[PDB]
Design a protein around this nucleic acid. Structure first.
Ligand code: CA
Ligand code: CA
Ligand code: CA
Length: 223
DNA sequence: ACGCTAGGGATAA
DNA sequence: CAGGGTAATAC
DNA sequence: GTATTACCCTGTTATCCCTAGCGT
């Protein structure tokens, strides 16, 4: 069987590469569960055909996290992250790291979880039926944060920046989180957009759910 | 005075 | 976060 | 020549974070 090391430098159309990809059939349990959090989060799952295959594109500032993810999707990621250095309209230099997996049908499973009546969206029962503590941990490392950033604060309330979703979508996410994890949470507004507020009352619950998956360089997001 | 909000910005998506 | 562009293989 | 496609690249902001100042 073809070893990843054997094709991680060939052309995208290489014969050996495709043979390699045919050795792979599906994502494992982690890759899938974390996948859910990443898609709700900062990851991007796209298809260049009509849905035959999907790949995942990653871009984050924190390099340590970018590596944790790549290492997680190891078999699916041929190259190390690429340093991206761009200039703003201001003339400032912003640095970030890029990376992605190759396309493969094994990714369709994750993608279809976010497809209804043929349009990307947030299904009503996504939380209840698929979001696991691992998924939640990754959603947090991506869009999570504190409610109160003031110095010397004691409020343990957490937040999930769901600003790119519609209020209806977030309302369903909230319902799922309350029912499945008994989390005391509710939608709030920021920039006239949806964010999830999780009362400090449930911090300890929330924390123990995701603690097994967060990494050191992400612990700063917690109160 | 000060804990807490919601307002707001230069990124980090 | 989304999509766009292409150097590298295949036939 | 035409089909493929992973690894960059660019277009654009909704992001997460900070903090002015409201309410008490
Ligand atoms: Ca995000
Ligand atoms: Ca993030
Ligand atoms: Ca965004």
């Amino acid at each position: 069987n073809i070893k990843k090391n054997q094709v991680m430098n060939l052309g995208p159309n290489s014969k050996l590469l495709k043979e390699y990809k045919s050795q792979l059939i599906e994502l494992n349990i982690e890759q899938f569960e974390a996948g859910i959090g990443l898609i709700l989060g900062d990851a991007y799952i796209r298809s260049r055909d009509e849905g035959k295959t999907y790949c995942m594109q990653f871009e984050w500032k924190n390099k340590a996290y970018m590596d944790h993810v790549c290492l997680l999707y190891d078999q699916w990621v041929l190259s190390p992250p690429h340093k991206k250095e761009r200039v703003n309209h201001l003339g400032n230099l912003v640095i970030t790291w890029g990376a992605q997996t190759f396309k493969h049908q094994a990714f369709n499973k994750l993608a279809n979880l976010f497809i209804v009546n043929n349009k990307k969206t947030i299904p009503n029962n996504l939380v209840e039926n698929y979001l696991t503590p691992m998924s939640l941990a990754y959603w947090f490392m991506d869009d999570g944060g504190k409610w109160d950033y003031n110095k010397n604060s004691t409020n343990k309330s957490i937040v999930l920046n769901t600003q790119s979703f519609t209020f209806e979508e977030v309302e369903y996410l909230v319902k799922g989180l309350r029912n499945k994890f008994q989390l005391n949470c509710y939608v709030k507004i920021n920039k006239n957009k949806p964010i999830i507020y999780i009362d400090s009352m449930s911090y300890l619950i929330f924390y123990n759910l995701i603690k097994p998956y967060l990494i050191p360089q992400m612990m700063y997001k917690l109160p």
